[PDB]
Design a protein around this ligand. Sequence first.
Ligand code: NAG
Lengths: 65, 65
Amino acid sequence: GPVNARMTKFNVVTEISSVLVLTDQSGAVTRYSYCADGFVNGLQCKLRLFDIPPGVYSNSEVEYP
Amino acid sequence: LGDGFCADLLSNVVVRRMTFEKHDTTYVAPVTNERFTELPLDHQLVLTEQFLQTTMPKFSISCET
Ligand SMILES: *[C@@H]1O[C@H](CO)[C@@H](O)[C@H](O)[C@H]1NC(C)=O
């Protein structure tokens, strides 16, 4: 990429991801969160909720090779 | 065997009838004139057991797993 002034940015994807998304009235995504960026993010994708109220949430699972 | 029949398998194979022990009631009809009545002379103390299922474990299912 030719440097101007900046430069076009690049990201090589290595694996398949899960993403929770929120749509607006017209169906366009206005809020996302990747399911593996952290501990709370995995619970967000398990419950389909961005703002998790307090509670007891059962059967979160660990993946193994 | 069904239909009030039973198979006696002690000495040789015989088909007999089932019976049930006859019980009484605690309601006493009122005495309105002079007559005969049948009063008990003594009582037998009886223990009867009764099982009723009340509980199960709960299940959490990850159906994708
Ligand atoms: C859902 O869409 C409606 C219009 O259909 C509008 O009130 C708003 O964009 C959204 N409301 C909620 C509570 O999500």
